[PDB]
Design a protein around this motif. Structure first.
Motif, PDB file in Angstrom:
ATOM      1  N   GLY A  41       0.770  -1.228   0.000  1.00 13.45           N
ATOM      2  CA  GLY A  41       0.000   0.000   0.000  1.00 13.45           C
ATOM      3  C   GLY A  41       0.802   1.280   0.000  1.00 13.45           C
ATOM      4  N   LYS A  43       2.958   2.504   2.058  1.00 14.43           N
ATOM      5  CA  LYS A  43       3.515   2.903   3.345  1.00 14.43           C
ATOM      6  C   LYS A  43       3.236   1.901   4.462  1.00 14.43           C
ATOM      7  CE  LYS A  43       3.464   7.921   2.554  1.00 14.43           C
ATOM      8  NZ  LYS A  43       2.867   9.227   2.948  1.00 14.43           N
ATOM      9  N   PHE A  44       2.638   0.751   4.171  1.00 14.17           N
ATOM     10  CA  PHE A  44       2.221  -0.193   5.198  1.00 14.17           C
ATOM     11  C   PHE A  44       3.019  -1.486   5.110  1.00 14.17           C
ATOM     12  CE2 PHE A  44      -1.667   2.042   6.490  1.00 14.17           C
ATOM     13  CZ  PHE A  44      -1.865   2.872   5.404  1.00 14.17           C
ATOM     14  N   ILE A  77       7.249  -3.484  14.740  1.00 15.24           N
ATOM     15  CA  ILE A  77       6.409  -3.445  15.934  1.00 15.24           C
ATOM     16  C   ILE A  77       6.946  -2.424  16.930  1.00 15.24           C
ATOM     17  CG2 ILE A  77       5.515  -4.803  17.856  1.00 15.24           C
ATOM     18  CD1 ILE A  77       4.205  -5.639  15.360  1.00 15.24           C
ATOM     19  N   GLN A  78       8.270  -2.388  17.103  1.00 12.92           N
ATOM     20  CA  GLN A  78       8.883  -1.459  18.045  1.00 12.92           C
ATOM     21  C   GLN A  78       8.579  -0.010  17.689  1.00 12.92           C
ATOM     22  OE1 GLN A  78      13.061  -2.857  18.392  1.00 12.92           O
ATOM     23  NE2 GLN A  78      13.021  -1.916  20.431  1.00 12.92           N
ATOM     24  N   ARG A  79       8.669   0.336  16.407  1.00 11.60           N
ATOM     25  CA  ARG A  79       8.609   1.729  15.989  1.00 11.60           C
ATOM     26  C   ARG A  79       7.200   2.222  15.692  1.00 11.60           C
ATOM     27  NH1 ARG A  79      13.892   2.071  11.906  1.00 11.60           N
ATOM     28  NH2 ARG A  79      15.357   2.835  13.498  1.00 11.60           N
ATOM     29  N   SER A  82       4.296   0.432  19.471  1.00 10.70           N
ATOM     30  CA  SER A  82       4.737   0.452  20.867  1.00 10.70           C
ATOM     31  C   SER A  82       4.329   1.780  21.510  1.00 10.70           C
ATOM     32  CB  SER A  82       6.243   0.218  20.977  1.00 10.70           C
ATOM     33  OG  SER A  82       6.581  -1.105  20.591  1.00 10.70           O
ATOM     34  N   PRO A 291      -9.595   3.109  10.305  1.00 13.20           N
ATOM     35  CA  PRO A 291      -8.265   3.447   9.795  1.00 13.20           C
ATOM     36  C   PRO A 291      -7.244   2.358  10.074  1.00 13.20           C
ATOM     37  CG  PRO A 291      -8.682   4.635  11.827  1.00 13.20           C
ATOM     38  CD  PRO A 291      -9.902   3.796  11.573  1.00 13.20           C
ATOM     39  N   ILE A 292      -6.261   2.277   9.181  1.00 13.83           N
ATOM     40  CA  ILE A 292      -5.131   1.366   9.310  1.00 13.83           C
ATOM     41  C   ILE A 292      -3.899   2.201   9.634  1.00 13.83           C
ATOM     42  CG2 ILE A 292      -3.843  -0.512   8.241  1.00 13.83           C
ATOM     43  CD1 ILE A 292      -6.779  -1.120   8.531  1.00 13.83           C
ATOM     44  N   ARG A 293      -3.317   1.976  10.805  1.00 10.44           N
ATOM     45  CA  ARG A 293      -2.131   2.715  11.210  1.00 10.44           C
ATOM     46  C   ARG A 293      -0.875   1.890  10.963  1.00 10.44           C
ATOM     47  NH1 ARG A 293       0.995   2.500  14.721  1.00 10.44           N
ATOM     48  NH2 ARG A 293       1.080   4.777  14.973  1.00 10.44           N
ATOM     49  N   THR A 294       0.250   2.592  10.913  1.00  9.24           N
ATOM     50  CA  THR A 294       1.547   1.978  10.681  1.00  9.24           C
ATOM     51  C   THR A 294       2.610   2.930  11.211  1.00  9.24           C
ATOM     52  OG1 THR A 294       2.986   0.952   9.027  1.00  9.24           O
ATOM     53  CG2 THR A 294       1.827   2.971   8.399  1.00  9.24           C
ATOM     54  N   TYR A 295       3.869   2.545  11.041  1.00  6.04           N
ATOM     55  CA  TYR A 295       4.968   3.431  11.394  1.00  6.04           C
ATOM     56  C   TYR A 295       5.021   4.589  10.404  1.00  6.04           C
ATOM     57  CZ  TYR A 295       9.725   5.199  11.731  1.00  6.04           C
ATOM     58  OH  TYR A 295      10.830   6.013  11.824  1.00  6.04           O
ATOM     59  N   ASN A 296       4.817   5.806  10.905  1.00  2.00           N
ATOM     60  CA  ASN A 296       4.738   7.006  10.078  1.00  2.00           C
ATOM     61  C   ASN A 296       6.024   7.807  10.237  1.00  2.00           C
ATOM     62  OD1 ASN A 296       1.984   6.604   9.108  1.00  2.00           O
ATOM     63  ND2 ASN A 296       1.345   7.090  11.205  1.00  2.00           N
ATOM     64  N   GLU A 297       6.833   7.843   9.184  1.00  2.00           N
ATOM     65  CA  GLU A 297       8.051   8.634   9.182  1.00  2.00           C
ATOM     66  C   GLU A 297       7.763  10.038   8.659  1.00  2.00           C
ATOM     67  OE1 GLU A 297      11.323   6.845   7.039  1.00  2.00           O
ATOM     68  OE2 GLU A 297      12.712   7.364   8.657  1.00  2.00           O
TER      69      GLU A 297
ATOM     70  N   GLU C  81      -4.878   9.454  14.728  1.00  2.00           N
ATOM     71  CA  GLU C  81      -5.342   8.771  13.527  1.00  2.00           C
ATOM     72  C   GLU C  81      -6.320   7.650  13.848  1.00  2.00           C
ATOM     73  OE1 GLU C  81      -1.606   6.602  12.167  1.00  2.00           O
ATOM     74  OE2 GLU C  81      -1.185   7.230  14.224  1.00  2.00           O
ATOM     75  N   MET C  82      -6.266   7.108  15.067  1.00  2.00           N
ATOM     76  CA  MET C  82      -7.162   6.054  15.515  1.00  2.00           C
ATOM     77  C   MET C  82      -8.388   6.589  16.241  1.00  2.00           C
ATOM     78  SD  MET C  82      -5.768   3.164  14.516  1.00  2.00           S
ATOM     79  CE  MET C  82      -5.479   4.098  13.017  1.00  2.00           C
TER      80      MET C  82
ATOM     81  N   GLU D  81      11.919   9.176  13.338  1.00  2.00           N
ATOM     82  CA  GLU D  81      12.161  10.113  12.248  1.00  2.00           C
ATOM     83  C   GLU D  81      13.198  11.166  12.621  1.00  2.00           C
TER      84      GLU D  81
END
Ligand SMILES: O=P(O)(O)OC[C@H]1O[C@](O)(COP(=O)(O)O)[C@@H](O)[C@@H]1O
Lengths: 417, 409, 418, 402
Positions: A41, A43-44, A77-79, A82, A291-297, C81-82, D81
């Motif tokens: 996707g 970014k996921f 998972i850590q970034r 957590s 919503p689907i969250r993930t590590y966002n840089e 976001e959640m 980041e």
């Protein structure tokens, strides 16, 4: 008080996400990644869907079981996962498991830790599938049916049903017959073109699951697998029930077909990514209500610049993630992940470019998947000569090309992986 | 370098973020100037805050008085990642010198040795640790960052004249007739609103200013001249601490005072070689990062492709064909089919109807542009419907469009 | 589950707390310290989290720096976001007259644009200056099942204390029939003259209905713009208000006990509520892992007990000692010591509440008192033994409870520099 | 300042801690409880943060769940980041770093700081980084004089401030040339030029694997190793005191180090706001002291009582009580270390002992008064320190569930 039964159900539940999947049919894409850690996707990562489903379903206690090439998954998972305050009874627990000489065995290894969760219900999830589901609705259906084990089910094309567990059900969605990965899949009685397949998603009475795993650990005839061993045993006992996926599947358009992708093959992975680039994607990633969250840089906005000849760029049905820098060029039916660099005079068509890919000048890429951080040398052409593609890289039966850093290095092209 | 590290550790940064930004017209009516959007995904205050972090100063006090909520919310979402037990925090201090005096009790408890005073409405990169070193080595009680500015624009700054070794001999705040530098009559030596203070000395100064007499309670108008007259003020040339990738280039610093300068500063980032480097991993600028979807480009209603020339497209955007040239599109911008967008700044959530043409304009947040609207081609028609600057830059806001008849619901 | 998910909690945290005297001179009442490590607002916020309501708007007005800082430190862990957040909603003091202050409803009306954008179906109105445990999800269910537009949490209180609350009378169907705000002569309950049915300042609203009500109230020139004085009577007269008995949703370990709820209105009540936690069987259970109260947690060292200067033991009877404390011998009885409290040798501390960072000099005797944050008690000072001497130096309540502050000690010549 | 920014800290946290007996059964040594509310690894991690090194790689290998869980809950607050993170790197000591060389290379660090995660100390790594660069060394090793009778457990070296000779764990330790009573010991703390370390690890992987036993002698022979005196960077409030550093190798040393914090003037300062030690902070209730069954008060002499504890009267002397410890009425606790969640029944007497986590001591049990009876029921060290474990109590017939 269905709302009360609703809320009180995820609160008494714990989600166990099986994330040890090797993803062998994905070839070199999973050589140094677990399948749940595969990019998707733009970014996921694939595991983000099961985790996000748990959060949005009210299940904030999660155990991620890992077994194959675990570093990049653990770091993800850590970034990105957590953020929990564990004093408030919410956590994402990393539960490593060792390969022993199945899926149920990885849970049995961590049974001491899982018992201390003191959960009443256990939700078993596959962390390598892409879908949206409200597990709280499935929990209610599990309790209302009085079941000890509830299995999420969905009709699938019979020509693809040999990869799943296939079941036949009662008038009250009770499983009567179950066969795991049949070479000749039994068809549904109302429809010979479809088979009723198990989705690898289970709800268990916690105490019942613990006893079952204890017995299975002592059984020398068992392969210690949920589908091959446990589910048939529960079915024979008459304690297993089925949960139709449309009851809990989350989708914006209610007239559409339920979305669920196992992403088993390179072609299916390539296909699922490009779906998001189409005009009307089957998977809705713009829904604020699930919503689907993930590590966002903190990537910079996607940058489009003139090419060396001062000419503009063209884009047709494509996704361009943050940090990308595109110099003119033509990008069509493609998905570009984060920090992808495309230099002047390039033509990119029906391609999936994973993060940090560097595309040299005057390259043409068609119907391919470029792995992470590949450095494509200037002038390279991919997807136009079938024989030349198969020599240099991997080429699937359907004609989809997979390019990897090791492949480019063996060809003599310098690359920083 | 040992002096270097131990210096920010004994320092606290106070960021004045009450700026109204009136010269930006409707752009700052519902926002404080530090909360103004910039760079597609940032707010102006993110630069001063990021400079503090990258300079080793992890203790910050943000003073907010004007249009507080959107600034406060931004601090909450993007700048609340600290563990205060480790002597690091971003403190919201509701309330120029009077705003610091009001919070003097809280600031004293910081127990800082040095106080760094910053303006939160400017865009620049600076290593405050280098300025701290220069402050200590010069033995100064107050150090003022300075930079040469064109004399025709110097009336908006505090203008200074320095001694042989960067002392402060003369200082005048916003002079109508700005004195020219003796080494060059073309430019005046201007104050950047960035100060380093000996903490105990600053506290005494603020106490005295509160009690007497008819002062404006302003750093530039009152405090700095008093320190200069006492002979305790020194100057810090900005190139000593300015952070820039190309060392041969001119020092970057933008006050973003007028609509044209704001429009100009944003489009610089869309150029081939921007003057402001936002790709430098060694001095990153952080902000609140949402989980926006990747920028989406789709065919228009006629199945035709889209064209893009020197433009930025942020996450969540959906562009249907159209032509995007020399433009910056913020988050969640929707551009429908058959559009022509040239030299335009589109703030977050802007909805552009089909067959629109936008040129040399700034579209404010969540504007709903109706189908077929043309902006930037008829000067008289633009000035009637919206705000048009002297240079020809058009500012469009949801209220302007609502008074025009087309609703924004 | 779907019920708390469609709800937003608005916490009124502008309370002055004037009856707490100097304890609220430089802080809002929701920011008042409690329980050794908590602030009062932590209970309403924790109740929201544990009830499944993860979208919160904290409305702040009076002395808000320490309250905002507390939210920044301990309640800024959300991934927005959640669809979860704690929003700081400042409100300004507005007056509908020369000496007529606008009330609690006006603070919400000021932030109505932001609150509308939450797109909530239900709004939960909470008072952030009370100490209690409640599962708002149960109240939401009762609100929907009763078909009410406004649901008011209620509880029987002693009639001699009912003049501080809104007092109501209800149906068998549980609809509110009569409502009077802060009556000087509170109506008694029909089944019991010793008690009055009181409003707890906790409401559940249909969101769209509340917005309309606030819009109308903003345009009403005869309204004081207060929930209790204006809105609730109007809803009651319209017949659209219903009552929610607190025991239905009150969270308590022992089901045989009485529902716990403390408004902490007076200095004596504040002193009393804190010392309850030091008793053998506290009325408020802070050891329940199933309904935890979170707050800003600093990495304090374990409570340290050391010998006094003469090398003798220390003695402790029914007392709480928070982290970072260092106690040199001394006798601590029926007392609650907050974080980083320093008690030097030869001290006797009895029935005392010591707020964070208090420094008690050698040979001090403190009895029936509340010591404010960071007070530096000089060597040999005695408090709580001479009534007239205590009232001269500090504040002394009618019941004999003494409040000590750094400013009081400075006027007496005792330096407070730290 | 620019030196820690180009640095990455690698914390070796795979230590089995065999000499601690049952204390490391089901635990890694860095996960061992200490100081009432901390774990041993918190010191190395906090040292990195306070030194300006916000990029950390924790390599874990032995009984890793509780250590990983601790990192997740207390050390996962980073915004990656901004180039700051604590990364979990599952895996001799050098081989663990070599196995993760691909990930470590992607850090793009100029300097690598190698740390042992099973030691207790305060150090400013930024000062060591400066000394490393100024000396022009390729590898810098932190060193400290130790008693020669205990030097056989360390790597011992000699220097001109450049390395000369080295010997890893010598049975006959060479004494320092200026003093025969001490030996110059390596502290297991290294600073490396990043590119040089990578090359060295590549060569070592191909050589048919401990930092001290293999790599350091090779670097010393090449003449590229230098020494860093620990007092140059050791953080301590009292500058006249001796440098604090505890390897916590034996049960007696572990028991000793914990009780130091309970003394009037502890050698280790945990009240220094300028060098704080962070850990996972649960919202525990304040330590609770209540009257005993007879309504009597309680007595405390030089003791630490952590949050969540409930003490019913009793006498607690020279002891350290971890979180959620229950002490019932009529108890006498002297020179004892009680790990989290310990339940002590009424009328118990505990002396010179370490009680492991969640032990349920039955009513009336006495420990630390009869040597032969203690050694039969539990583990008793040569110095007389007793270790009590849930398994030990359950073997004796005392139920532990709970
Ligand atoms: O008393 P406040 O308003 O809380 O503020 C603390 C004040 O006390 C002080 O310690 C001064 O006290 P003394 O000069 O009496 O010792 C300063 O920190 C400050 O002026």
């Amino acid at each position: 008080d269905h709302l009360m039964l609703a809320r009180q159900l995820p609160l008494k539940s714990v989600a166990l996400i099986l994330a040890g999947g090797r993803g062998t049919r994905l070839k070199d894409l999973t050589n140094k990644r677990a399948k749940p850690a595969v990019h998707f996707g733009g970014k996921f990562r694939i595991i983000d869907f099961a985790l996000s489903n748990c959060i949005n379903s009210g299940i904030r206690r999660m155990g991620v079981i890992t077994q194959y090439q675990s570093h990049t998954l653990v770091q993800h998972i850590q970034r990105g996962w957590s953020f929990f305050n564990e004093e408030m009874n919410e956590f994402v627990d990393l539960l490593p498991a060792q390969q022993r000489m199945g899926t149920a065995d990885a849970v049995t290894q961590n049974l001491d830790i899982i018992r201390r969760y003191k959960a009443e219900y256990v939700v078993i999830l596959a962390g390598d599938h892409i879908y949206k589901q409200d597990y709280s609705r499935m929990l209610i259906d599990h309790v209302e049916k009085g079941a000890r084990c509830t299995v999420a089910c969905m009709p699938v094309p019979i020509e693809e049903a040999s990869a799943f567990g296939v079941m036949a059900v009662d008038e009250n969605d009770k499983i009567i017959e179950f066969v795991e990965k049949p070479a000749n899949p039994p068809s549904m009685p109302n429809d010979p073109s479809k088979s009723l397949a198990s989705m690898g998603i289970y709800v268990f009475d916690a105490d019942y699951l613990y006893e079952l795993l204890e017995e299975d650990d002592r059984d020398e005839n068992s392969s210690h697998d949920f589908g091959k061993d446990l589910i048939p045993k529960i079915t024979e006992a008459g304690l297993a029930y089925a949960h139709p996926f449309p009851l809990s599947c989350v989708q914006s358009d209610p007239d559409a077909e339920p979305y669920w992708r196992d992403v088993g093959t390179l072609e299916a992975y390539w296909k699922a990514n490009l779906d998001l680039a189409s005009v009307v994607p089957e998977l809705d990633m713009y829904d604020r209500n699930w919503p689907i969250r993930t590590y966002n840089e903190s990537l910079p906005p996607a940058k489009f610049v003139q090419d060396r000849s001062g000419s503009h760029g063209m884009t047709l049905n494509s996704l361009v993630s943050g940090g990308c820098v595109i110099s003119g060029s033509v990008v069509v039916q493609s998905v570009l992940f984060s920090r992808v660099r495309v230099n002047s005079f390039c033509n990119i068509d029906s391609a999936v470019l994973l993060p940090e890919v560097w595309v040299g000048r005057s390259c043409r890429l068609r119907r391919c998947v470029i792995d992470r951080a590949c450095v494509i040398p200037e002038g390279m052409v991919i997807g136009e000569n079938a024989e030349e593609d198969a020599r240099r890289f991997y080429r699937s039966e359907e004609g989809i090309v997979l390019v990897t850093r090791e492949m480019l290095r063996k060809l003599g092209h310098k690359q920083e992986r």
